[PDB]
Structures are given as structure tokens and as C-alpha cells.
Design a protein around this ligand. Structure first.
Ligand SMILES: N[C@@H](CCC(=O)N[C@@H](CS)C(=O)NCC(=O)O)C(=O)O
Ligand SMILES: N[C@@H](CCC(=O)N[C@@H](CS)C(=O)NCC(=O)O)C(=O)O
Ligand SMILES: [Cl-]
Lengths: 202, 202
């Protein structure tokens, strides 16, 4: 069967959405309401992904893959000719895995209290201060080469771009951001990024 | 030179510490004071890992690998005959990566607000409720086979064991835990696990 990506516009699922397009693979997308857990076809999403989260990818064997970091690696490895991640077993691949884990744990999950309407303002300020430090660190790495892992665009950039959009939407203060901003401007120009954004109507 | 793991007793670094011992690799360890950022030799830890966290693994070429998820895959891939993780390219490997990311993002980082004395009670309550659901979900998986990924012990078990110890230290309420508790008793018997704990003076 053709792959299907479950997504919410602008959510973390934008990362494998971009990767799908960078990879030139065939796929469809299906929007999910994360509150009601119903998809845009009326389907009960919990019967699909019990974790009730996006992204989830239906593979061509009909099975489901969850967790963004797993999905983008799966997709990149399907298209080695596109060099969207270093080949398995190489030190470069372990550093790609390192950065994917950093993005998932320190950036992505770092936003959790900010998106919870039960979190009080004062704690949100503390959370924002930590994200300042983390994004500023990323900025320092981006001073050294065009993309996160080096000179070449990779799946880690799809993920970084996605969470960085949240930083801008939340008007996050970032002390060191000049390299990050130039990086974001460039990544936003990629045809696959533009097409993913258009498909999500954002 | 011999690979070196920087760790703090009982912290997330216990995971790659267990994996090192299970792998049978040559290594040394060095303890870090996370408050002062000095190691047990008095060395400046920020000079070693600018992120200032454990675990960090210095490889035999003198380079730095951070992020527990990256480290445990690097280590397991070095010893494929021990089958501590599925081989690359296989659907099973993507399921392992899926579980490692879940542990990193939903369990490990789930605990972060609970260890910070600046987190207000009301948010800690929300976090505890989510972890109850997440550990109960893990329990439901452990009800169906001996270890997290299936019939065999893997690096994901080293990681799950490590964060589950925190759940016990924090008296975390877990609705479904009979399988998780049996599993913890089992993993705790492994000589490599015992050796890691003894080396960390736990
Ligand atoms: N650990 C998951 C987390 C993914 C995640 O946090 N998805 C959010 C959107 S950014 C979500 O689906 N929340 C669903 C909800 O309302 O419970 C991963 O890394 O893929
Ligand atoms: N994203 C990192 C997080 C590592 C982490 O959170 N380490 C904690 C110990 S559990 C730490 O070193 N905190 C430093 C501190 O307390 O200042 C990873 O997955 O390895
Ligand atoms: Cl298509």
C-alpha cells in the first residue's frame, strides 16, 4: 500500500512531512484532530496510534511506525541515493542520531509546558529561559557550516526547522540567534519545505 | 586510547554504563559533579562536554559522543554477536529506535520537571499523571514478552531499567505495574547490571 502520514498542521509531524518530500517517495497525508482524536475522514485515531500522537506513518506493509526520530531515519534509509542522513554504522550516523535525540528531548519536549494551558506564567518563564540556552547553543553550531550536521541538508534539519517554527510562533527570546535566523530563511526556500507547508495550509 | 564514560551515580548515564558492561568492551569511567561541573579528578567538565550533561562517551579516537540514545546504539553496533540491538536496515531496528525515542522523550524527559525544585506542585501533579499512563502503557507491552523489544534483553532495557529506578525513588503511582515490577526484578539480577550499580556505589 502507499505510505500515509498522520499529521497536524505545524505540529512535529511537519518534520517527516518535509522528509517524505525531500525523499521523492509516494505518500498521502491524513490530518488528525489531537483533541478529539478523530481524523479528517472521521476515523477513530486511537485505534490507529494508541499513543494518540502525530506523527505516525503507515508503512507499505500496512504496519505503523511512530516517533518522529524513527520515522525520519526510516525514510532517509529508504533513499540512500538522496543522502538525507549518513549511512548506518558510520560515526557520522551516530552524530546524526545524537542531534536527532537532542532536538527531540531538549527542544521538542522542552516546549511541552508552553503548550499546556494549565501551566502558570512563572514556570513558563523558566521553561523559556532554558529554551533560550538550547537554541543559542544550536546557533553556535550553525556558525560553523550551512546545516546542522555539516555542509549537507539532512533529516535533522527538517526536525530543527519544525521546532524552530514554534520558537518564532511563541515569540521566544533567543540570545544568540543570528546564524539560526539565516539558516531558517534558507531552509524555508527549499521546494520540499515550501510544498509541505502548502499541503498543510500554513 | 580506551573509551571513557562520564557519569553520575543513578543518573541516565547508568544506561550506557550497563551497556558497556553487557558489551564486554574495554572502557573506563569518570564521575562528574553536575553542580560544580568538575569531574572526580578535578577536571573542568564543560571542557569535555559543553552541554554539561552526562552521559558523555569519549571514543578511542578522542572524539565526543553525547546523548544516551546515540551512545547505546554506537556501543551495541560494535558487538553485533551479542544481539543487544537489531541490525541496521531491519524493520526491527526501526522499532528499537522507536522505543529508544519514546523512553528518551516520554519517560526520561518526563522526569525532568520532577527533579527540579523550581517546578510548582500543580505542574508536577500533571507530569506524574502522564507518567502513570506512560509506564502503564509500558507495562502492557511487558505483559506480552519478557523484554521491551521482545524475547531478548536489549539496550532499550538498559534505558528503561535506568529511568524506572527513578519512578521508584520518586514513589511514582503507576496504575498497571505488575509486569513492569517483575521485569525490574529480572533485569536487576543480570551481572552486568549489578556491576554497573556497584561501580556507581549504589
Ligand atoms: N515522542 C513523540 C512525541 C510526538 C508529539 O509530541 N506529538 C504532539 C504534537 S507536536 C502530539 O501529537 N500531541 C497529541 C496530544 O494532544 O496528546 C515523538 O517524538 O514523535
Ligand atoms: N538529552 C540528554 C539529556 C541528558 C541528561 O538529562 N542528563 C542529566 C542527568 S539525568 C544531566 O546531566 N543534568 C545535568 C545537570 O543536572 O546539571 C540525553 O538524552 O542524554
Ligand atoms: Cl505522492
Amino acid at each position: 500500500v502507499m505510505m500515509k502520514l498522520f499529521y497536524k498542521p505545524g505540529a512535529c509531524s511537519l518534520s517527516p512531512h518535509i522528509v517524505l518530500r525531500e525523499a521523492g517517495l509516494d505518500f498521502s497525508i491524513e490530518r488528525v484532530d489531537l483533541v478529539t482524536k478523530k481524523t479528517e475522514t472521521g476515523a477513530d485515531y486511537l485505534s490507529i496510534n494508541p499513543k494518540g500522537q502525530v506523527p505516525a506513518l503507515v508503512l507499505d506493509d500496512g504496519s505503523l511506525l511512530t516517533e518522529g526520530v524513527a520515522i525520519v531515519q526510516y525514510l532517509a534509509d529508504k533513499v540512500p541515493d538522496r543522502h538525507l542522513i549518513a549511512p548506518s554504522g558510520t560515526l557520522s550516523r551516530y552524530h546524526a542520531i545524537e542531534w536527532l535525540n537532542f532536538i527531540a528531548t531538549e527542544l521538542h519536549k522542552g516546549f511541552s509546558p508552553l503548550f499546556n494551558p494549565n501551566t502558570p506564567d512563572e514556570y513558563k518563564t523558566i521553561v523559556r529561559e532554558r529554551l533560550d540556552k538550547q537554541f543559542s547553543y544550536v546557533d553556535s553550531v550553525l556558525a560553523e557550516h550551512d546545516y546542522l550536521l555539516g555542509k549537507k541538508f539532512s533529516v535533522a534539519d527538517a526536525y530543527l526547522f519544525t521546532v524552530s517554527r514554534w520558537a518564532n510562533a511563541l515569540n521566544l527570546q533567543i540570545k544568540e540567534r543570528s546564524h539560526l535566523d539565516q539558516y531558517m530563511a534558507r531552509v524555508a526556500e527549499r521546494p520540499a519545505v515550501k510544498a509541505a507547508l502548502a499541503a498543510e495550509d500554513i
